[PDB]
Amino acid sequence: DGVGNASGDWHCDSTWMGDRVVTKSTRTWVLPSYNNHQYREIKSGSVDGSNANAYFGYSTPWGYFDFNRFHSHWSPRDWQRLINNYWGFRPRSLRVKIFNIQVKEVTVQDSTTTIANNLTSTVQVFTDDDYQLPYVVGNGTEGCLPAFPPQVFTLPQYGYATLNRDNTENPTERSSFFCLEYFPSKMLRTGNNFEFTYNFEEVPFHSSFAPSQNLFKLANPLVDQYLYRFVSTNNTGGVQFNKNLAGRYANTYKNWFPGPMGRTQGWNLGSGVNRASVSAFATTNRMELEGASYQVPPQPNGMTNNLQGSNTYALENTMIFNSQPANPGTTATYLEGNMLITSESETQPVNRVAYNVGGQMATNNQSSTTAPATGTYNLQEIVPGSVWMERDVYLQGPIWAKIPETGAHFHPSPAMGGFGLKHPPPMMLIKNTPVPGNITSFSDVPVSSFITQYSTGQVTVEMEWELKKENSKRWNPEIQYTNNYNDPQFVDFAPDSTGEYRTTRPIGTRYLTRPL
Amino acid sequence: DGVGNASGDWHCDSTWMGDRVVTKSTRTWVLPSYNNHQYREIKSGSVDGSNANAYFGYSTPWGYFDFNRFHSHWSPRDWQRLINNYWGFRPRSLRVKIFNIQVKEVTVQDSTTTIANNLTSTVQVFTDDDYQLPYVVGNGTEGCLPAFPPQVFTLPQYGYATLNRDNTENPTERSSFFCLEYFPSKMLRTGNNFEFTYNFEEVPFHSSFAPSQNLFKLANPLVDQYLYRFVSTNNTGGVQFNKNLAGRYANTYKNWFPGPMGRTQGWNLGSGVNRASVSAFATTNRMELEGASYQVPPQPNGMTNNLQGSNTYALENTMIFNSQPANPGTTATYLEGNMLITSESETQPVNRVAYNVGGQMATNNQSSTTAPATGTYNLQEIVPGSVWMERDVYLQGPIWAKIPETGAHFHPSPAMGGFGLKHPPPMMLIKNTPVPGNITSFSDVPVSSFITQYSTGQVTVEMEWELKKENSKRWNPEIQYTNNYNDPQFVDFAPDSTGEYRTTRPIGTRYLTRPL
Amino acid sequence: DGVGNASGDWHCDSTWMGDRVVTKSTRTWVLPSYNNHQYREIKSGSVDGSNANAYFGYSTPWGYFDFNRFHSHWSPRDWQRLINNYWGFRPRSLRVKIFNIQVKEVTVQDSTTTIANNLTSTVQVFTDDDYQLPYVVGNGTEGCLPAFPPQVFTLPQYGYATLNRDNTENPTERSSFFCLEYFPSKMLRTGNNFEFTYNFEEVPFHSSFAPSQNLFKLANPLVDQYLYRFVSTNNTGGVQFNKNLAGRYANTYKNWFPGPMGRTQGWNLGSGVNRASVSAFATTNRMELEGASYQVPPQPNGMTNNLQGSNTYALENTMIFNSQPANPGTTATYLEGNMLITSESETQPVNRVAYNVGGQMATNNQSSTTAPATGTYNLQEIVPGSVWMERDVYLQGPIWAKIPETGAHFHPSPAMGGFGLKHPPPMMLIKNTPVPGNITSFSDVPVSSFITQYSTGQVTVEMEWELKKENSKRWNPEIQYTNNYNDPQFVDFAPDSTGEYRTTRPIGTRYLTRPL
């Protein structure tokens, strides 16, 4: 109500209630006045050698809230209690509240910055709940609610890239400009707040279980099939058959088949024997899209890398994360030790690997002059009767994504991971309202001389999750995530001497097992 | 409600109501923004020569309220009316209120500190009422509500020490990190307040009476016992007996026995004849605990020191206090005159002393070649039928303590003194919410450049105490605490020329007597 | 009702319902007619060199049901879901049913055993629910419901050892004989069953959490104590003091102390450097009890062995199990690899170790001719203010035990582990009723010529357990039990090529952590 009255409390709890959990999470944000309160037309040409990077777009003076990562809601213990006890989870509800807003005036006079504040400047927030803006949230960008609650993060500047012309920087006649002050906002002073609720649509549970049984080994090895296989041909042209025996799985008949595949290059981590002095951009997996050719990591769902205890990964197919956040616009060459290299190892009984071929088809029609030839294929798409296992979600990883507004789509699982929503959580845009300076005379040109200012405040996000409870009759103990460290020099998922929150390793979700 | 309206009054009264007393106490506090609003990993090795001092832990940017001393609630007169009229007291209720919060911005520009204030910055308070944090309150640390009401105290920085590995500074896999912004707080501006109530659980009354009768002298010295004692043996092997006479207490049969004991070293105060040039750390009483060996002062309840008018104390077994508060991290070598050396002299009819042996057992089996031998023991633990007298509480001393969350414990009286609570009064954590500076561009690294600020305000604590009234038929006058000073140069428990509140001597609670 | 009608179904399910779980478990048993249907007076002298082993007792023709092990109710997966999610469990109810009884006549004629059956022979069962018999169940003996449900176990023969005279085999006048046919039984034919219910009394939860914080390190390492310690003495006799600093835990004042202790010998497992050619029976920990001296493994609660990653254990203080069951009356010398050696490693922040001393007391009274001496003690019993951590329960370990019917006891936690019940689950005695042979004439001597026969059947036991749910705000992932094997040659807690259920390692219950 007033300036000397808090407009919201710090809620950062987490209440497990049966097959239901709410995870409140309050963080503190800073909004710099981006672009000095005006729109800019940003563009670029063929940088990094490729004309893929040429874009046309607009950068706004708006910041936005991007809590589309799992660590923004889950502590590493509450994540551990999730991934070791439940076979699924999905979001149900969402409740965001921006509160305790305070706006500061920085005045640089005589080499002395003076950060005062006014009780009069406003901050306008709106929520794009009709999806009329480019939804830039679910695309794996920075600027999120941090993993650690007393970290104060800055809000990322809202920009978007529209259509360009002929892979150049120049616009096209179909490229549109969206003014964000053409949306009804809510101008908030230092005693006002912004509540907002959201109910998720029915999405499937994230299948957070490892396969406890191979896909091609679903028959029992005791009784043998009543189906015969072609084995050979005699000295004449006549065919011969044998019974499909019990333990032999390389030749039984199968009901179900693995998912999609596209063969990627396999690179050795760890000890490693790799090719030396490699500039691997011209040999990676491209996917041309009306013009230029784009790298597409990670490749679509239905594959895996890192079989089991193998140092070979498919680095084109994995979700490499960093241990700490980095400076925006860095060119440092990181190594295997610095980065959190994701392994989808557990999904190998269902998914084919990415650094090998899937199988082989026929090449020629046989005759008594022509022996039958085969040939390995590097990519196989959807076949009727396929079954795959989607990409695992991680603590340091995205929660949802938006399906594009095209007419058609197939099986909307995001390739990076998470949930494919049709109407995702709306993008909370926020900016500082501009305050003019010392205008003494009238001029028809708009004001360019504003009071420089930022604004800070807190925000809370209350998620709600529906759990799929574990119902297994497995006898022996399962593998579960544990805090195993051979006398470390530091506690992990906890600060250090400086105060830097330190995450050493990624945390998956497939730890419990389940028979096919 | 608003900034120009006080959100709480100064209550510092004390209302004696029958067998019930409420002691309100308002103080004024200052909260420095510790660690510049971020967590730190603190650690240390084997300092002071001993690997006992090696710890691993975290220091928070939170301050806390620690009113766990008796002088924070009791004036020296209201304490005197307590200790001279009542045989017991225990806490019943508790009511804490933080009010009149105001937060100041210090700006050091051109060698000129300018302490302004904003009406917009918040302060978040929560109360750990589920005991999910390390309860660092009841362990005899500084930073309390002062003994004197117009003293303005600063809030102590909340830190805790978790498990370390192999007596080094390095962490272990079982050492946990608690983020305190993961608790639901209450962000308070300059017009808001924080009320909180608490009801104590049923604890025993503090037995605030001296024994008016010895424990081994509970028979009357007029009639003699109907029980005989072994006295000697004749020139043959035959045993002989005598009757237990009336006045003789060194050989009657006893029903009850003293409490626990561990023999400590006895050091002479006053005039004194002590060992010279002593480095007494290698000769003190250690108690090894999974690794290193810790000094444990004071040793557990059931002993005493300073018999009666003896300059010999057990300095390992007493509660030495200071006359005035000291600078944090001092290495001054204080003397007997500066310090308030506690004497548990009055509990000598029940408790054995600490600088002597308790008794003697048998050493050998006797025969007609072997005379019976004895041997003095230096420590005797709980025996069925024991009775002891717990440590006295003092005006300058702790009120409660928390029992640890292990499965088992025996007789939870804190060795330092006071009340052993299972669910103690919850620890009121409080910090300044961080205000960012002049962030002009987006970066994914968290904000490290905050506006430096502190916040002050008042706090009141209303205790409630249940009294055990004195019901004695003693004829002669009892000893009571009195203001006896042979024409002092200053009034005691009152300020001086500078304005320093001066306490010269400790004040016990056992002044009235009571027969066993 | 009839012989061609099953009198009970196979229930071996396990239903997790909130903070409550029922574990049904059906096994199949065989009852040999022990002693050929008559009582025997069994006795022994000082075998194995020690007169401790001399006993006097009686062996009955009764078998009994002994489901007092945790694997008899918990599959290794249902045990894993318990020990990784809950901070406690205790039994609430019990329901035993003996059903599908069938009794077989073996007839050895002309070197040809012919196992027929009659529909007429009975089997009598009763339940000792007034505790009038010696309760031989809770003492860690064989003959239990197996860990694996399709294992068919035989019922152990009920015997007991009464008082003997002067450590010989001869009886005493106070040694009593209990006839078990003097109890009202229930004679069951092949169409009858025996239902029985039992409600447990309120026992404490098993504290199934590791300490996440040391006992002597409960102060925070940031603020320092308001209590001073004796440090040394100057060149004169005068004492000197220092403040207890913050990080230093070897010299702060403590509120709580570890539990009981008796120093045992420490033997190195693993790589190991041990004494060679050892006959360690004359150097172990004995406890003399009215006559002879008994080994007492494991020593009472409040200690530990195996600090952390140390090959040294206290083999006198641990619960060594076997991988497979063994033949009754074996003398094989097993090794470290064959046996399941229990480690109580996680209870080291609270419990002192068993292969070291606990601390040191004072030895002499100091003076200026006598320096202060100390001395390490090997055993310390209950001290007021103690806190310990009881022995962990295991999957291959006992559930309950009976407190003896003496007048007094202290803290009835069984030293082997589990629950100390005053009225334990009653001992289900069962025997074959005797069937006489071909008696053709009258004689006053009783019949010694019976039809040799055994009887088999199924039994189910339905336990009910109350769970103490995990409520922690820990951030980082906890250590949990997992199925970790570096490509084993066999699945563990599962059969092998022969069909032998193979357990390789013991499973504890303290996996989650909890602050003190």
Numbering used by the authors:
A (entry chain A), B (entry chain A), C (entry chain A): 209 to 724
Original authors' sentences:
Adeno-associated viruses (AAVs) belong to the Dependoparvovirus genus within the Parvoviridae family. Because of the broad differences in their tissue tropism and transduction efficiency and the absence of pathology, AAVs are the promising vehicles for therapeutic gene delivery. Adeno-associated virus receptor (AAVR), which is a glycosylated protein containing five polycystic kidney disease (PKD) repeat domains in its extracellular portion, was recently identified as a key proteinaceous receptor for multiple AAV serotypes to employ the post-attachment events of viral entry. To dissect the divergent rules of engagements between multiple AAV serotypes with AAVR, we select two AAV serotypes, AAV1 and AAV5, and solve the atomic structures of their complexes with AAVR by cryo-EM.
